[PDB]
Amino acid sequence: DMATRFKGLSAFPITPADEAGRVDIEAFSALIARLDAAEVDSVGILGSTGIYMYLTREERRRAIEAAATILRGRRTLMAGIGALRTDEAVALAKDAEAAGADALLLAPVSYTPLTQEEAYHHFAAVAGATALPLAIYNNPTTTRFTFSDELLVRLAYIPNIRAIKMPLPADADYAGELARLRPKLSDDFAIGYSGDWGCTDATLAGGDTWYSVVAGLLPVPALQLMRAAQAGNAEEAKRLDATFQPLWALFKEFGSIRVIYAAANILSLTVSEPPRPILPLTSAERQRVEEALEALS
Amino acid sequence: ETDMATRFKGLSAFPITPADEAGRVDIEAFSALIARLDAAEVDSVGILGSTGIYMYLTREERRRAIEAAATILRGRRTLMAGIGALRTDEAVALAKDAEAAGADALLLAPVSYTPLTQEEAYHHFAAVAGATALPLAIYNNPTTTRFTFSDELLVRLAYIPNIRAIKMPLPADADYAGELARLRPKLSDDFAIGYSGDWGCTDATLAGGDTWYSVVAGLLPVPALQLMRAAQAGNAEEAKRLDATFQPLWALFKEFGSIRVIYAAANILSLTVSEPPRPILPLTSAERQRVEEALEALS
Ligand SMILES: [Cl-]
Numbered sequence: 001d002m003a004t005r006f007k008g009l010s011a012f013p014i015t016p017a018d019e020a021g022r023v024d025i026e027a028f029s030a031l032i033a034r035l036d037a038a039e040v041d042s043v044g045i046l047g048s049t050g051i052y053m054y055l056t057r058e059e060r061r062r063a064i065e066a067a068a069t070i071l072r073g074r075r076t077l078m079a080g081i082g083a084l085r086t087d088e089a090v091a092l093a094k095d096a097e098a099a100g101a102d103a104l105l106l107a108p109v110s111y112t113p114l115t116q117e118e119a120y121h122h123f124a125a126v127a128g129a130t131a132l133p134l135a136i137y138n139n140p141t142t143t144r145f146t147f148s149d150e151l152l153v154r155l156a157y158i159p160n161i162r163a164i165k166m167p168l169p170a171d172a173d174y175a176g177e178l179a180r181l182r183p184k185l186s187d188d189f190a191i192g193y194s195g196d197w198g199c200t201d202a203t204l205a206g207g208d209t210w211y212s213v214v215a216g217l218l219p220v221p222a223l224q225l226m227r228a229a230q231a232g233n234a235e236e237a238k239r240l241d242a243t244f245q246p247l248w249a250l251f252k253e254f255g256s257i258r259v260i261y262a263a264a265n266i267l268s269l270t271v272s273e274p275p276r277p278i279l280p281l282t283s284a285e286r287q288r289v290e291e292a293l294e295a296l297s
Numbered sequence: 298e299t300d301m302a303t304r305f306k307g308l309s310a311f312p313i314t315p316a317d318e319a320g321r322v323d324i325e326a327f328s329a330l331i332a333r334l335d336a337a338e339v340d341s342v343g344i345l346g347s348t349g350i351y352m353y354l355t356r357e358e359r360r361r362a363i364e365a366a367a368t369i370l371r372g373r374r375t376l377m378a379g380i381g382a383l384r385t386d387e388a389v390a391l392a393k394d395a396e397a398a399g400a401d402a403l404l405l406a407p408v409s410y411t412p413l414t415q416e417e418a419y420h421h422f423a424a425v426a427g428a429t430a431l432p433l434a435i436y437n438n439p440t441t442t443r444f445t446f447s448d449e450l451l452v453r454l455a456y457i458p459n460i461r462a463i464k465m466p467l468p469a470d471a472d473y474a475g476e477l478a479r480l481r482p483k484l485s486d487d488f489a490i491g492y493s494g495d496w497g498c499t500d501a502t503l504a505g506g507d508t509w510y511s512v513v514a515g516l517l518p519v520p521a522l523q524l525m526r527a528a529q530a531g532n533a534e535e536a537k538r539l540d541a542t543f544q545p546l547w548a549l550f551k552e553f554g555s556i557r558v559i560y561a562a563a564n565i566l567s568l569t570v571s572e573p574p575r576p577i578l579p580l581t582s583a584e585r586q587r588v589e590e591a592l593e594a595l596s
Contacts, residue, residue: 020386053410054384085353086575087319109410111352111441112556112577122576142410144443257411276385277421278411 002133006163008041011215038219042076054275068100107137135163163190174205197248203229301432305462307340310514337518345379353574367399406436434462462489473504496547545591
């Protein structure tokens with residue numbers, strides 16, 4: 001079952017690029033090598049963290065090729081696919097497969113609000129485009145699309161769709177959400193989470209995957225936390241999670257993407273800034289990030 | 298001739314942009330739509346809005362569309378063009394393209410993936426506004442962005458010298474008069490405040506709205522203009538009478554989204570063979586039939 005490759009810690013690096021959107025493949029390569037060396041379960045490139053929607057088809061392809069040449073099929077490489085048009089999403093999926101991705105992550109990016117049925121047909125078309133397994137990128141924040149349970153059931157029954165990145169339920173009722181969904185979705189479907197500040201509780205509650213922003217930059221401490229959570233070691237996991245709380249606070253206040261760019265600059269892992277119109281943090285805010293990193297190290 | 302706000306007033310008609318499955322604009326069908334708008338004497342032609350699928354067309358096809366509209370109009374009617382992009386640099390380039398291709402005005406939406414701060418939206422608008430000599434309208438369409446302009450941000454933007462208008466969504470409580478009374482004193486003098494959401498725009502205009510950014514007018518400009526003129530003249534009962542002829546269409550817009558309905562209507566009227574850009578899908582068999590009935594009711 002291709003669901004297996006979606007499990008565990010999936011690390012989402014930034015995609016360093018200049019002001020014109022040209023990917024800095026040297027810096028990107030350094031980030032990938034760092035993740036391979038740390039032995040994350042998968043590398044999720046071109047997610048929201050990796051600014052896929054702010055890069056051209058060609059620059060996305062360049063990033064995937066570079067990551068594939070490094071990982072050499074020895075660590076799962078997942079690539080963000082999204083586009084406003086179905087035909088572009090299909091093309092991007094085919095590109096990712098040809099460039100060496102092992103898995104696809106599909107967000108229902110929208111302009112004109114889509115019906116549940118329209119989202120279904122879009123997913124089916126992209127799923128049919130390649131032999132790769134696909135995860136549903138369920139992120140109403142960025143996509144402005146909300147999956148009904150009914151739609152999730154339909155999608156979980158498309159042959160190569162084997163996983164979902166869920167948002168944190170407003171509830172923090174991860175156990176309740178998993179108890180509701182698992183019986184409804186296809187057997188062994190991988191149900192995971194993003195929103196780093198809730199992911200240890202989500203994993204302790206039974207979540208299959210942490211789609212992790214912090215891991216894309218600091219894979220080592222993120223791995224230690226994830227392993228404790230996966231083992232159901234709640235005492236240890238909660239202690240380790242507390243070390244990240246200063247970083248979590250910053251994620252919640254400012255959005256993880258702005259914080260992670262600031263952190264990457266502090267660690268000399270990038271000189272890039274977010275793609276405009278996204279703007280970086282203030283000097284005082286960057287200082288808070290520096291202090292948050294100190295708490296971890 | 299003093300204030301560029303004046304070109305944004307009245308009926309701004311938003312045609313579809315006919316295009317094949319690959320996103321190649323059908324310039325022949327588009328040309329006829331533009332010509333029909335000019336013949337009906339609409340106040341402005343608003344191409345490449347959400348109705349005109351601007352976000353589903355390439356920079357090159359968008360330019361082709363603007364060039365064609367300018368070619369047909371030859372400066373006889375104000376041409377406004379939608380110019381949004383996720384990236385500031387692409388939005389800037391689209392604006393420059395539009396000016397070079399013969400647009401008279403620009404319409405700018407805060408297209409988002411990663412949610413933007415109020416300040417981030419400000420700098421994006423300022424960069425685009427600074428990129429050309431054209432006036433710009435703020436495209437306040439939160440259903441396509443989930444970006445809420447705070448009143449503070451509207452004040453900031455309305456002070457950008459060449460931003461002279463805004464397309465507001467319908468207020469949730471339908472208090473047009475209250476909204477206008479709050480905004481007019483805070484925004485720059487003579488700022489043109491208009492509305493979209495066709496089923497609410499007769500009321501909005503009667504309450505004092507400056508512009509109807511109109512979906513139905515892009516296809517059926519003659520009855521839409523009759524309606525707008527009655528509302529503008531303060532002929533409230535005539536306006537309401539005319540508004541009621543559109544009510545079958547209004548109900549379909551509200552249920553299914555105006556874009557899907559207007560594509561159905563354009564096909565029914567033999568003005569396009571195009572379908573919405575996938576993943577947007579057309580209406581059902583029975584639903585198209587309701588559109589046909591709505592058009593008969595109108596005609
Ligand atoms: Cl325990």
